[PDB]
């Protein structure tokens, strides 16, 4: 891809010497991106979930799978099976295309952006991020949207540590703090 070979040269050469790995199979690689958006308010009407799915499919070149509530919670006034969020899994070429077109022309568009948290690693090397505003992607033209529905990114990688995930993700110029 545009960034696939970039990774396969620079990041592999860096992480082969950084951690004294004996094999190229040992250096961690990113395996998928999960774009989540739990609408929550679609209990009021399905139109909100359809709109959010439209925005998610615009943002990432894939139709979003509609996720329904797994269990009924009386606190949130939902019951089992209510369509409540949208989710996209990106792998391979689309994964890398979205990764580049994010870390290039979507993070810079974050209002009052000064860096993404570097300590926000789950402990298994995977990273997560919230945007609070979908308009930060160029695909939203402001002339067909209705709300500022936020979005969530989860970069799932094969790293086995937070240091490994940070090392892998910094080589791509991740705007950390």
């Amino acid at each position: 891809a545009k960034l696939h070979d970039y990774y396969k040269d620079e990041v592999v050469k860096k992480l082969m010497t950084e951690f004294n790995y004996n094999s190229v199979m040992q250096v961690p690689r990113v395996e998928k991106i999960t774009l989540n958006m739990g609408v929550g308010e679609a209990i009021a009407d399905k139109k909100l979930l359809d709109n959010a799915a439209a925005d998610l499919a615009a943002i990432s070149g894939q139709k979003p799978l509609i996720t329904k509530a797994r269990k009924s919670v009386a606190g949130f006034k939902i019951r089992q099976g209510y369509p409540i969020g949208c989710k996209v899994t990106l792998r391979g070429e689309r994964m890398w295309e979205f990764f580049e077109r994010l870390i290039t022309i979507a993070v810079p568009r974050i209002r009052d952006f000064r860096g993404l948290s570097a300590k926000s690693f789950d402990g298994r090397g995977n990273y997560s991020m919230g945007v609070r505003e979908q308009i930060i992607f160029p695909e939203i033209d402001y002339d067909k949207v209705d709300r500022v529905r936020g979005l969530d990114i989860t970069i799932t990688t094969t790293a086995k540590s937070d240091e490994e995930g940070r090392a892998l993700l910094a080589a791509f110029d991740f705007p950390f703090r």
Partner: protein, 314 residues
């Protein structure tokens, strides 16, 4: 059966319903008295008695209450409306060689109910098409204020899935219904339209014509627009639901445009008359039907005979 006219039949009907209500009240009285008797002890080794028990058990029966619609037709309040609501300038529309609207201009002040009247196919529904934006006028210049939110009710009910139940068709399956600002329970909202029991389970196709009109209004008033475009809203409705709708229309903060052929229903609510005439002229008159007739009498023409009553046979 009944021999007589509508008003005499109405009187007979009120007397019948009053007698039935009185008999039901007496039944409640007697049932309470006999229940008080049943809830006493035997007092010794004496009877109590199974014949009276049997009489009370057979007295505990069921009576059919009238499923009368009456005043519950719920028109939700829309967003606050500014003074500029709707304005048309020199509106003109034609089809082929017959023209329906020609150089029509009028402005709708807020809070107004506009009785749109005229002959068949004069353009009454096409005007609603232009206002709702589904048709494009030849002479243009239809405009709405930026606060205006439009809710439209069609002349035809051919948009509801006859398979779905009443509750599913009205609410879409979501337990909570969003109406503008406030979230409303879907079952409560549906019951606001006389479907107050297990009538939520009936199918749209299995519904009757009047129930179809009621469900149509329920499904199409949920958008919460402060401008209403009702096209023949009292088609299959009876006098009770008609009165309920008239009251709901009166207690409306927004404004509405109602196309109808019921002169009495239009007269009881209309504040501006939009009446179609020949050669595609749509006379607009600000006022109700009383003052419209008075204006016609003030500047009238000398005749009274419309029809000819041609024939069928030969």
């Amino acid at each position: 059966p009944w021999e007589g006219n509508y008003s005499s039949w109405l009187e007979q009907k009120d007397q019948r319903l009053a007698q039935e209500a009185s008999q039901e009240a007496a039944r409640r009285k007697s049932i309470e008295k006999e229940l008080e008797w049943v809830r006493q002890g035997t007092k010794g080794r004496q009877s109590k008695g199974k014949a009276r028990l049997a009489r009370f058990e057979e007295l505990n029966s069921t009576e059919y209450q009238k499923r009368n619609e009456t005043n519950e037709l719920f028109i939700p309040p829309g967003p606050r409306l500014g003074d500029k609501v709707l304005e048309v300038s020199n509106l003109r529309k034609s089809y082929g060689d017959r023209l329906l609207i020609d150089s029509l201009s009028f402005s709708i002040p807020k809070g107004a109910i506009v009785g749109i009247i005229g002959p068949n196919g004069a353009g009454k529904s096409t005007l609603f098409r232009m206002i709702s934006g589904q048709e494009q006028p030849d002479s243009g210049t239809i405009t709405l204020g930026e606060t205006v939110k439009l809710a439209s009710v069609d002349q035809f009910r051919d948009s509801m899935d006859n398979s779905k139940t009443v509750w599913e068709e009205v609410s879409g399956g979501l337990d909570i219904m969003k109406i503008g600002n406030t979230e409303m329970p879907s079952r409560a909202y549906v019951g606001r339209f006389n479907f107050k029991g297990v009538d939520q389970g009936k199918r749209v196709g299995e519904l009757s014509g009047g129930e179809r009109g009621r469900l149509h209004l329920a499904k199409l008033l949920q958008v919460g627009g402060n401008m209403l475009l009702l096209d023949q809203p009292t088609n299959d409705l009876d006098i009770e639901t008609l009165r309920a709708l008239e009251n709901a229309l009166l207690e409306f903060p927004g404004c509405a445009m109602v196309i109808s052929h019921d002169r009495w229903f239009l007269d009881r609510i209309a504040t501006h008359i939009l009446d179609y005439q020949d050669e595609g002229k749509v006379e607009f008159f600000e006022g109700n039907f009383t003052e419209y007739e008075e204006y016609k009498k003030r500047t009238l023409g000398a005749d009274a005979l419309e029809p000819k009553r041609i024939k069928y046979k030969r």
